[PDB]
């Protein structure tokens, strides 16, 4: 039904799951690399976010992720992210739970103040050593000196073609292994531990929100339907149970007041 009917459910909901999609990041001007304007140079983003592309050209893969890390400098969380964060803070002092399950890798939910965050696809600001497996936070600009001035999005740009030795290297003593971005690539599974946390949130929630994506599309498809099958209401906020059409920065400040 209406927004007034959603607010009734929202006022009584004690454990809210928020499934956050690409729409939420696109509203902050964050480049998504899906759709028609989801291109970097002469390749598809799907072409680069793969174990195969990193094995054959780690320099080109690192140039792509270096760009994505650098564009975040000028990006700020929108009214959607803020309303989500303030909602968690406020409801937490009332002994009620708000959890954000996101596929976004830009950390804007983290900058807005969301604490209960599940980043199922990893983060741009995390590296993983291909030799020792250590996962680490990395906000350094540029991530390595050979990547200084590299990663121009424009097609025609020559490959930086950095030797593997000069790409980001693990700083753990005696390792020096090749680092990769700590993100889920095409053909890779989600971390089972992260999946267990997700499963647990979905099974205990009394309200579920799907924002800047829909329930009939991945990853919200692996999550939101089994919530609706338990009887629990699902509200979708998108540019396309309850459904609310429009930007998240418009509908969420209101819904989550
Ligand atoms: Zn290492």
Curated annotation (Swiss-Prot):
GO terms for cellular component: cytosol; mitochondrial inner membrane; mitochondrial intermembrane space; mitochondrial matrix; mitochondrion; nucleus. NAD(+) binds at residues 21-40, 103-106, 212-214, 238-240, 248. Substrate binds at residues 65, 68. The active site is at residue 121. Binds 1 zinc ion per subunit. Keywords: Cytoplasm, Metal-binding, Mitochondrion, NAD, Nucleus, Transferase, Transit peptide, Zinc. Changing residue 32 to A: Abolishes enzyme activity. PROSITE patterns: SIRTUIN (PS50305). Inhibited by suramin. NAD-dependent lysine desuccinylase activity is inhibited by physiological nicotinamide concentrations, while deacetylase activity is not. In contrast, resveratrol activates deacetylase activity, while inhibiting desuccinylase activity. SUPFAM superfamilies: DHS-like NAD/FAD-binding domain. InterPro entries: DHS-like_NAD/FAD-binding_dom, NAD-dep_sirtuin_deacylases, Sirtuin, Sirtuin_cat_small_dom_sf, Sirtuin_class_III, Ssirtuin_cat_dom. Widely expressed. Its main location: mitochondrion. GO terms for biological process: mitochondrion organization; negative regulation of cardiac muscle cell apoptotic process; negative regulation of reactive oxygen species metabolic process; peptidyl-lysine demalonylation; peptidyl-lysine desuccinylation; protein deacetylation; protein deglutarylation; protein demalonylation. Its EC number is 2.3.1.-. GO terms for molecular function: histone deacetylase activity, NAD-dependent; NAD+ binding; NAD-dependent protein lysine deacetylase activity; protein-glutaryllysine deglutarylase activity; protein-malonyllysine demalonylase activity; protein-succinyllysine desuccinylase activity; zinc ion binding. The mechanism of demalonylation and desuccinylation involves the presence of a 1',2'-cyclic intermediate, suggesting that sirtuins use the ADP-ribose-peptidylamidate mechanism to remove acyl groups from substrate lysine residues. HAMAP family: Sirtuin_ClassIII. NAD-dependent lysine demalonylase, desuccinylase and deglutarylase that specifically removes malonyl, succinyl and glutaryl groups on target proteins. Activates CPS1 and contributes to the regulation of blood ammonia levels during prolonged fasting: acts by mediating desuccinylation and deglutarylation of CPS1, thereby increasing CPS1 activity in response to elevated NAD levels during fasting. Activates SOD1 by mediating its desuccinylation, leading to reduced reactive oxygen species. Activates SHMT2 by mediating its desuccinylation. Interacts with CPS1. Interacts with PCCA. Monomer. Homodimer. Forms homodimers upon suramin binding. In contrast to class I sirtuins, class III sirtuins have only weak deacetylase activity. Difference in substrate specificity is probably due to a larger hydrophobic pocket with 2 residues (Tyr-65 and Arg-68) that bind to malonylated and succinylated substrates and define the specificity. This is NAD-dependent protein deacylase sirtuin-5, mitochondrial. It comes from Homo sapiens. The lineage of its organism: Eukaryota, Metazoa, Chordata, Craniata, Vertebrata.
């Amino acid at each position: 039904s209406s927004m007034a009917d959603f607010r009734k459910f929202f006022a009584k909901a004690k454990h809210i799951v928020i499934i956050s999609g690409a729409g939420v990041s696109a509203e902050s001007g964050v480049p998504t690399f899906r759709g028609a304007g989801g291109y970097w140079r002469k390749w598809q983003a799907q072409d680069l976010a793969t174990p195969l592309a990193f094995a054959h050209n780690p320099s080109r893969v690192w140039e792509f992720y270096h760009y994505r890390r650098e564009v975040m400098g000028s990006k700020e969380p929108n009214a959607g992210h803020r309303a989500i964060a303030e909602c968690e803070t406020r409801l937490g002092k009332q002994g009620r739970r708000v959890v954000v399950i996101t596929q976004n890798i830009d950390e804007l939910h983290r900058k807005a103040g969301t604490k209960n965050l599940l980043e199922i696809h990893g983060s741009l600001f995390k590296t993983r050593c291909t030799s020792c497996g250590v996962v680490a936070e990395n906000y350094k600009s540029p991530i390595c000196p050979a990547l200084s001035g590299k990663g121009a999005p424009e097609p025609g740009t020559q490959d930086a073609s950095i030797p593997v030795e000069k790409l980001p290297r693990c700083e753990e003593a005696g390792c020096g292994g090749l680092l990769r971005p700590h993100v889920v690539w095409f053909g890779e599974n989600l971390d089972p531990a992260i999946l267990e946390e997700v499963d647990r949130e979905l099974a205990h929630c009394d309200l579920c929100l799907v924002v800047g994506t829909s329930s009939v599309v991945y990853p919200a498809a692996m999550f939101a339907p089994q919530v609706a099958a338990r009887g629990v209401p699902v509200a979708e906020f998108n540019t396309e149970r309850f459904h609310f059409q429009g930007p998240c920065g418009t509908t969420l400040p209101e819904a989550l007041a």
